[PDB]
Amino acid sequence: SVAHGLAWAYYIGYLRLILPELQARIRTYNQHYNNLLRGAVSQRLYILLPLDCGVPDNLSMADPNIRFLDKLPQQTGDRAGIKDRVYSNSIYELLENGQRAGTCVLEYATPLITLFAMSQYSQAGFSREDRLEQAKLFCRTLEDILADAPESQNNCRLIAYQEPADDSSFSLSQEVLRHLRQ
Amino acid sequence: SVAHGLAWAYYIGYLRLILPELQARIRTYNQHYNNLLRGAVSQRLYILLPLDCGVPDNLSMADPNIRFLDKLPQQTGDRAGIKDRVYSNSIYELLENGQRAGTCVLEYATPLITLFAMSQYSQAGFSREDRLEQAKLFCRTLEDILADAPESQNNCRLIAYQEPADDSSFSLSQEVLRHLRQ
Ligand SMILES: Cc1ccc2c(=O)c3cccc(CC(=O)O)c3oc2c1C
Ligand SMILES: Cc1ccc2c(=O)c3cccc(CC(=O)O)c3oc2c1C
């Protein structure tokens, strides 16, 4: 199953590399730049999983109530496949009624980019119906991996959502805040 | 299947992003740094695909005849999923009979790390046998993707090989040299 393999890949090649040092990076950020931020960023990593697999090039553009505010201090890879590689993470502002309502580290789950591209490419042999099914199966698989993984205990949060195609009322901002507020 | 999704993820999440600008970066390096080099590093990215899925932490240690030379001046991602990740690429010299026989930018295919880890974890439900099967499938699928891909025409070489299991009449540098020699 492609989702099975992608979920494992996203854990083995990203999450288990980034999550162990995340809180420290955040705790650190909250010290050096507390006077600049005048706030605290939350300590979990929030992973957006849109099941329609639409991943915009700039999160800061997908909802106008989500603005980029800063990057986290960098981490350098000292491990197979990422030796001397530089990872950063972005911090975002969440707006409600034009005002900051929360601050968090936010990103889209990259394998969704792959699911979407496989549905667009002939050579992948992968239909739109294949895509939504595999996206749900990806999210369930990743949940199971995380629920029992040494690195992902209490520092990661999966935000899965399906855009009702009927209206444009849906708010990514509100969705994130729903999870945020606890 | 796992390998099929992984080859696509690897193309979509890495190769399509690093290949287009690779050839410019190597020509830049060839021209700017000709005094040091007294040679030309070759123009393609060479991708080690050990079928046993053994990826070391340190490439340079794998073979006494593969030696670190330099880093390629970097490239910062400017697309969906990769704003400001900094990729590091290394140039290596290949020795034959104690003498420099070639110079190329070399790395291991990261999804092999995932196939290996999947065969270690019981939750992934993946046997050692599945692993070899998927490794071959991964290489063949990646081949077919690259053959048709516009952004990866004449700038990429897959080096797939099988180490004799325990005895070690294997030279990684000979494997790389054999491909490089065209
Ligand atoms: C831009 C992009 C697109 C797709 C993937 C991906 O499918 C994928 C699947 C498994 C693991 C990774 C690694 C990562 O997210 O850094 C992946 O990265 C991708 C990236 C970085
Ligand atoms: C350390 C490590 C391990 C496994 C993968 C991976 O399976 C994988 C699968 C698809 C795409 C990527 C992205 C990349 O190679 O940068 C992947 O990256 C991995 C990395 C970076």
Swiss-Prot record, chains A, B:
**Subcellular localization, per the record?**
Endoplasmic reticulum membrane; Cytoplasm, Perinuclear region; Endoplasmic reticulum-Golgi intermediate compartment membrane; Golgi apparatus membrane
Q: Where does 2',3'-cGAMP bind?
A: A9, Y14, R85, T110
Q: What is the effect of changing N89A?
A: Strong decrease in c-di-GMP and cGAMP-binding
* Quaternary structure and partners: Homotetramer; in presence of cyclic nucleotide (c-di-GMP or cGAMP), forms tetramers and higher-order oligomers through side-by-side packing. Interacts (when phosphorylated) with IRF3; following activation and phosphorylation on the pLxIS motif by TBK1, recruits IRF3. Interacts with RIGI, MAVS and SSR2. Interacts with RNF5 and TRIM56. Interacts with TBK1; when homodimer, leading to subsequent production of IFN-beta.
> What job does this protein perform?
Facilitator of innate immune signaling that acts as a sensor of cytosolic DNA from bacteria and viruses and promotes the production of type I interferon (IFN-alpha and IFN-beta). Innate immune response is triggered in response to non-CpG double-stranded DNA from viruses and bacteria delivered to the cytoplasm. Acts by binding cyclic dinucleotides: recognizes and binds cyclic di-GMP (c-di-GMP), a second messenger produced by bacteria, cyclic UMP-AMP (2',3'-cUAMP), and cyclic GMP-AMP (cGAMP), a messenger produced by CGAS in response to DNA virus in the cytosol.
Q: What else is known?
A: The cGAS-STING signaling pathway drives sterile inflammation leading to type I interferon immunopathology in severe COVID-19 disease caused by SARS-CoV-2 virus infection. Tissue damages in the lung and skin lesions are caused by activation of the cGAS-STING signaling leading to aberrant inflammation. Endothelial cell damage is also caused by activation of the cGAS-STING pathway: SARS-CoV-2 infection triggers mitochondrial DNA release into the cytosol.
> What's the name of the protein?
Stimulator of interferon genes protein
Q: Which organism is it from?
A: Homo sapiens
| Gene that produces this protein | STING1
